[PDB]
């Protein structure tokens, strides 16, 4: 019913080989609590897993694609909580080569609450200018930053007669008038008939505020999901001591260099991420940053729980395993690298993992690839670490 989005923008995939396997594991069977980003898909890719998606909380990015068409048929409303380049809630860019996307096919797309539309540099995309946008954008937030390119090489979404565009706002905020709490159309005059609640969905009943039930996303849920914190106000949020990367002091720090390693000593729970990069172990000549030493990594031998991701793209060649994390037990996956992964190990050259205490990954996928020395990847009980029917292990380029 409810899934989470992804947070890479125009960046080449971390694994081009398992990109479609990553997507399918995320949007398999309705509401996306984040950004829907579909980039670098091959022309023969099958996207039958996107058929049931209904609403997107953030923005919809479809860029650098080669597919014939993306089947987001039932997509109703993209709320635009987050925006691409802080202006656009829908962004279609460079779909093709200088095949490519053919038609939008967003047949039921009715409301974009906050944000704009950006369509540019599409070699063979059509019907990008015959569809009105002012009838889709919400009245309250009319920041319709529209930048559409009309150049092509080949009042509806597509050529088919089933792609009829139902003008809603132009023909009350919404009508067919709808109830004040109904976002995307309605089939009647009551408050239990519309097909997308504007503010909250209390068991099929659209209301402005949750009955002080628990608010979560845009639905009045009876109890918060597994990996969500419940506050006294009544909200299911992710954040209400040590602080990891991207948390209240290191919001702009990208790696665990030698500058910010002393503050983790003696810690038993990091409220953030843990990113290891090539520049952590070779300090830049610009600043007096001594290269990190394998002996200085022992400050993580007391860690027990990490509230974010554990990303390793560089490791000292003297260390043959991750035994410095033999005490870490749970990765909460509340903050995921690129918005999708909670455990990544790429190009490390380790001979065995050594995460003997890991017993749960609260959210996000797992990438263990390009470790051409690494055995003991299958022997780990991965199904006993996952907690959702959306997590999977993606592994390529490893030791045979």
């Amino acid at each position: 019913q409810v899934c989470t989005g992804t947070d890479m923008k125009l960046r080449l995939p971390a694994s081009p080989e398992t990109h479609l396997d990553m997507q399918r594991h995320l949007y398999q069977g309705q509401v996306v609590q984040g950004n829907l980003e579909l980039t670098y898909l091959p022309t023969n890719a099958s996207l039958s897993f996107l058929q049931d998606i209904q609403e997107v909380q953030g923005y919809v990015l479809i860029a650098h694609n080669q597919v014939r068409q993306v089947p987001l048929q039932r997509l109703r409303i993209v709320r635009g909580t987050q925006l691409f380049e802080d202006n656009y809630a829908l962004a279609v860019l460079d779909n093709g080569d200088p095949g490519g996307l053919r038609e939008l096919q967003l047949r039921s797309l009715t409301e974009i609450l906050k944000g704009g539309v950006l369509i540019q540099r599409n070699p063979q995309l059509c019907y990008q200018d015959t569809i009105l946008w002012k009838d889709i954008f919400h009245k309250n937030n009319q920041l319709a930053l529209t930048l559409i390119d009309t150049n092509r090489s080949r009042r509806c979404w597509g050529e088919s007669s089933e792609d009829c565009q139902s003008l809603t706002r132009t023909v009350c905020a919404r009508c067919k008038c709808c109830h004040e709490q109904c976002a995307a159309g309605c089939t009647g005059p009551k408050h239990s008939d519309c097909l997308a609640c504007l503010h909250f969905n209390h068991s099929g009943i659209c209301e402005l505020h949750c009955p002080a039930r628990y608010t979560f996303g845009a639905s009045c849920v009876t109890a918060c999901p597994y990996n969500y914190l419940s506050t006294d106000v009544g909200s299911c949020t992710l954040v209400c001591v040590c602080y990891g990367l991207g948390m209240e002091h290191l919001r702009e720090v990208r790696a665990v260099t030698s500058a910010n390693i002393q503050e983790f000593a003696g810690c038993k729970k990091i409220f953030g991420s843990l990113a290891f990069l090539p520049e952590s172990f070779d300090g830049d000549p610009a600043s007096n940053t001594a290269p990190l030493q394998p002996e200085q990594l022992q400050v993580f031998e007391t860690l027990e729980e990490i509230t974010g991701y554990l990303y390793i793209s560089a490791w000292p060649d003297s260390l043959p395993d991750l035994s410095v994390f033999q005490n870490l037990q749970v990765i909460r996956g509340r903050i995921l690298h690129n918005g999708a992964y909670s455990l990544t190990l790429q190009g490390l050259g380790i001979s065995w993992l050594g995460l003997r205490s890991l017993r749960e990954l609260g959210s996000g996928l797992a990438l263990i690839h390009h470790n051409t020395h690494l055995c003991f990847v299958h022997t780990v009980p991965w199904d006993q670490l996952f907690r959702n029917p959306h997590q999977a292990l993606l592994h390529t380029a490893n030791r045979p």
């Epitope: 070779d282 290269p291 060649d317 790429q346 050259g349 390009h370 051409t372």
Partner: nanobody
Framework: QLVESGGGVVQPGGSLRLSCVAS????????MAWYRQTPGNQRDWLAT???????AYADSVKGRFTVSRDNAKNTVYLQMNSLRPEDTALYYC???????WGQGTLVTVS
Amino acid sequence: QLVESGGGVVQPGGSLRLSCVASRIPASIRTMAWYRQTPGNQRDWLATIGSSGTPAYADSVKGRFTVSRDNAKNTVYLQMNSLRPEDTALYYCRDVNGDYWGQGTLVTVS
């Protein structure tokens, strides 16, 4: 910043050897992987080579292609053998420890 060199036109049954020279000299020789993008498809993995030197080849090209490196010049080669008309595509080298990508060198077999 990675630049490859060694592609071009070749006869079927021939051989080729690409290179991938790093513009900067890293402190550690890192890990570089070889890909191949047939037009319209995702760039398929070919081979990977680590800092130590242990390689890993895909199933399709294992036994024909050979990957190696020279730490003196920080260049990684991809020695191709018994080339075949189906092998024509764009060949790119990526730096796995950093996610830096090359620009590609088109290899044509005819």
